[PDB]
């Protein structure tokens with residue numbers, strides 16, 4: 001049985017579990033309705049995302065979900081991160097309540113808007129990058145290293161707010177889960193297992209390339225065995241089609257082999273804010 005943190009505890013009568021969200025990208029996650037989550041509207045059912053355990057979960061799986069919830073409380077709230085809203089810990093299965101992102105992950109959001117009425121403008125793409133950088137600046141200030149920053153791990157709300165997901169979790173190269181995470185890893189993280197805020201900056205550069213390719217996959221047609229060689233030789237992805245020079249230089253600064261030569265997330269927020277101001 002779990003200890004109760006009263007300020008975060010939600011009554012089970014206020015929660016109605018709904019349909020599963022996607023598959024197992026972020027674990028066993030379902031859509032749900034929570035009455036009274038919004039303070040201004042006490043009776044309004046608010047759609048939330050609930051992370052829970054499988055029916056045959058181990059003691060390790062439970063401790064993992066508890067540590068994830070406790071790390072969420074420690075990091076704190078920010079507009080551009082997926083926030084903790086509450087939990088049901090007493091008298092039943094553990095349910096961790098999180099903000100719901102109606103428009104799914106950033107990769108699919110971008111791929112769907114490659115044409116038509118909702119086709120994203122150049123300014124909209126810079127705004128997406130700026131919001132991800134702002135959320136990463138907050139996580140770096142809170143001593144949190146994401147270790148897998150990618151468009152798949154950024155969620156988009158009904159109001160088009162970018163929210164970084166899968167940050168407080170606890171953490172082969174030829175294998176795939178429908179994605180090859182190696183294509184987002186910095187050389188020092190890939191070859192030496194070294195993770196820092198500057199390795200997340202490299203991943204942000206790959207995420208920028210994903211934004212300006214409108215949800216394209218990095219290093220097209222390159223097997224992972226050849227990627228190791230190409231990164232040591234100093235090769236980088238080409239400029240996305242239709243991308244400006246200034247934004248490609250930001251991507252190239254993120255991909256410096258020397259980690260301290262890459263910009264900080266504070267510097268990236270300033271660089272992307274300057275691009276939004278001009279154009």
Ligand SMILES: *CCC(=O)N1C[C@@H](n2nc(C#Cc3cc4ncn(C5CC5)c4cc3Cl)c(C(N)=O)c2NC)C[C@@H]1COC
Pocket residue numbers: 021022023024025026029030048049050051068069072082096098099100101102103104105108109155165166167168169
């Ligand atoms: C495989 C599925 C897929 O492609 N999906 C799922 C869908 N989705 N996922 C989320 C979520 C979440 C989330 C994020 C976390 N980061 C850390 N933690 C732990 C507490 C520490 C969590 C827990 C969870 Cl539940 C949502 C959401 N939050 O609304 C959604 N919404 C659709 C996105 C994507 C489908 O894209 C089209």
